[PDB]
């Protein structure tokens, strides 16, 4: 079985490169962030523009949803994160403490915490309610490319240009494990079940790691990734795929177990910096850099 993603919508409105797209947990919405300093909200199923959320003074690298789909957090070159009320568009909190661009962010499952990664080489854990930094982890020796909580929020995985992936105990901030050749690690995230870590390196390679055993299980290649921190995903709604953007302007889809490329989605006219997989339907969102500036929604039968 191969999927058969086809283009459903192209979403225009950002005036600079799109940095990140993410589906709301409830499936209703896509949020997009951009170098244009804006967040935009779009209907997941009809592609309809809903609203613009503004307030950052510089570009945004990443955005993430709370579990109840009511809040967003954004990470900005203004050295802050902001927590947003999606319905009102209002900034509830500005999270201050990083000493350089904030690059990546995520809520925990409970959504009482946010984790952030920065060019300042640190990972910070923030209290959503107070907006105060709870912990600063001296996580890496170069910019942090990704941060992600596991299924229950007990662990954080981080990645860096330093060539390391590290796993952190949330409660204590202590490092439990380093996975260490050491090309820049450009992306990491836990599998939905929390057992595996998907890691991108800037040698055109994605790898699936068993967290428990610290061993590489699968390698995915054929795409182009030597420059940018490109988001990758587990697609679990139909077939079990790996989905990534690519610097050849394509969305790549692999069979997770066999590692074969099963589909390449053509249409973007710049680097596909971000992909996201819908929580319940076989829908991918993709987004591209400044020669394109659009988001595409794609749908598959499997
Ligand atoms: C080649 C240019 C530098 C590069 N850039 C991205 O790699 C990159 C990547 C992304 C996507 N992203 C964001 C968080 N995780 C992934 C976004 C944006 C983005 C930010 N802004 C402004 C606020 N605007 C943009 C957008 F995309 F809109 F042009 C840049 C970078 O940071 N690297 C180099 C590779 C590695 S490997 C470990 C660490 C690093 C650091």
């Amino acid at each position: 079985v191969k999927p058969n993603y086809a283009l459903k919508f192209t979403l225009a409105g950002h005036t600079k490169a799109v940095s990140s797209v993410k589906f709301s947990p409830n499936g209703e919405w896509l949020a997009s962030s951009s170098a244009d300093k804006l967040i935009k909200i779009w209907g997941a199923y009809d592609g309809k523009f809903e609203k613009t959320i503004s307030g950052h003074k510089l570009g945004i690298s990443d955005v993430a949803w709370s579990s109840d789909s009511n809040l967003l957090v954004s990470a900005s070159d203004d050295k802050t994160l902001k927590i947003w009320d999606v319905s009102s568009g209002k900034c509830l909190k500005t999270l201050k403490g990083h000493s350089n661009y904030v690059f990546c962010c995520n809520f925990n499952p409970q959504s009482n915490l946010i984790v952030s990664g920065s060019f300042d080489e640190s990972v910070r854990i923030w209290d959503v309610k107070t907006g105060k930094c709870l912990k600063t982890l001296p996580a890496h020796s170069d910019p942090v490319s990704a941060v992600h909580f596991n299924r229950d929020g007990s662990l954080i995985v981080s990645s860096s240009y330093d060539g390391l992936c590290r796993i952190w105990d949330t409660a204590s901030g202590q490092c439990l494990k380093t996975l260490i050749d050491n090309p820049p690690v450009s992306f990491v995230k836990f599998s939905p079940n929390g057992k595996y870590i998907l890691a991108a390196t800037l040698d055109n390679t994605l790898k699936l790691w068993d967290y428990s055993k610290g061993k590489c299980l699968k390698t995915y290649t054929g795409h182009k990734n030597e420059k940018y921190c490109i988001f990758a995903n587990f697609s679990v709604t139909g077939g079990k795929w790996i989905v990534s953007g690519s610097e050849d302007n394509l969305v790549y889809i692999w069979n997770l177990q066999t590692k074969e490329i099963v589909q390449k989605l053509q249409g973007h006219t710049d680097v596909v910096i971000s992909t996201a997989c819908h929580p319940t339907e076989n829908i991918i969102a993709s987004a591209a850099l400044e020669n394109d500036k659009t988001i595409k929604l794609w749908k598959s039968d499997c």
Side-chain angles (χ1 to χ4, degrees), residues 1 3-47 49-56 58-89 91-95 97-128 130-131 133-176 178-179 181-194 196-211 214 216-302:
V1 296
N4 67 337
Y5 282 93
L7 183 62
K8 300 295 295 201
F9 301 101
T10 300
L11 319 190
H14 285 298
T15 61
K16 293 190 179 181
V18 182
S19 51
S20 192
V21 294
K22 300 294 178 67
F23 286 104
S24 61
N26 70 2
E28 184 179 355
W29 301 118
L30 186 77
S32 60
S33 64
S34 173
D36 70 6
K37 315 168 185 191
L38 308 174
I39 298 164
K40 290 172 185 287
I41 306 304
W42 318 83
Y45 306 118
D46 59 7
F49 170 75
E50 181 73 7
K51 67 179 75 183
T52 299
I53 295 177
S54 60
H56 282 296
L58 295 168
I60 305 170
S61 291
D62 199 14
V63 65
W65 293 90
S66 63
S67 290
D68 69 355
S69 306
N70 290 321
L71 307 179
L72 290 166
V73 60
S74 52
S76 177
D77 278 14
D78 70 8
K79 307 186 196 169
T80 79
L81 307 101
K82 285 173 181 289
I83 305 180
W84 308 92
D85 184 285
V86 177
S87 64
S88 71
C91 172
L92 300 178
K93 293 292 192 271
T94 306
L95 307 191
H98 281 300
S99 60
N100 204 332
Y101 307 150
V102 195
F103 192 63
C104 51
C105 56
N106 263 310
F107 286 85
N108 68 338
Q110 183 175 338
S111 287
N112 62 310
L113 299 180
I114 289 161
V115 64
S116 62
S118 172
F119 274 76
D120 77 5
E121 311 187 351
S122 77
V123 164
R124 286 180 175 247
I125 304 173
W126 309 86
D127 190 80
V128 170
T130 63
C133 186
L134 294 172
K135 300 185 162 67
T136 303
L137 312 187
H140 291 283
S141 62
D142 274 310
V144 181
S145 49
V147 288
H148 186 240
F149 287 100
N150 71 344
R151 176 168 56 186
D152 73 327
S154 55
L155 305 179
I156 295 157
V157 63
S158 65
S159 55
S160 167
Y161 191 92
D162 71 4
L164 299 181
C165 292
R166 285 184 165 154
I167 299 87
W168 306 88
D169 179 67
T170 299
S172 71
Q174 287 292 312
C175 186
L176 297 177
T178 299
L179 333 163
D181 205 10
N182 63 342
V185 187
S186 52
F187 184 73
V188 286
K189 78 187 299 177
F190 281 105
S191 69
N193 68 1
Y196 312 113
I197 297 153
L198 183 65
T201 45
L202 291 188
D203 54 2
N204 312 296
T205 304
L206 282 158
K207 292 183 170 168
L208 188 67
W209 292 83
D210 182 308
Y211 166 62
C216 181
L217 290 185
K218 302 290 175 179
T219 297
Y220 312 93
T221 64
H223 66 306
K224 192 174 173 205
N225 188 195
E226 58 177 61
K227 185 170 184 178
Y228 290 100
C229 300
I230 296 177
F231 291 90
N233 312 86
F234 298 84
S235 182
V236 300
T237 50
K240 306 311 165 118
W241 325 116
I242 300 294
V243 174
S244 185
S246 179
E247 292 161 7
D248 60 1
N249 304 355
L250 300 173
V251 178
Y252 280 70
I253 310 180
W254 296 261
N255 182 309
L256 185 153
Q257 294 302 344
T258 72
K259 305 164 292 170
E260 318 157 64
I261 296 161
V262 290
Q263 215 183 347
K264 285 153 62 174
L265 315 184
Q266 83 83 13
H268 285 291
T269 61
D270 207 343
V271 171
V272 180
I273 192 68
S274 175
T275 54
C277 295
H278 191 277
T280 65
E281 292 293 302
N282 305 319
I283 295 172
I284 294 169
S286 58
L289 297 190
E290 48 259 47
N291 188 49
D292 177 317
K293 306 191 275 276
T294 73
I295 301 148
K296 289 174 186 285
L297 293 168
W298 314 81
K299 188 175 191 304
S300 172
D301 299 319
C302 68

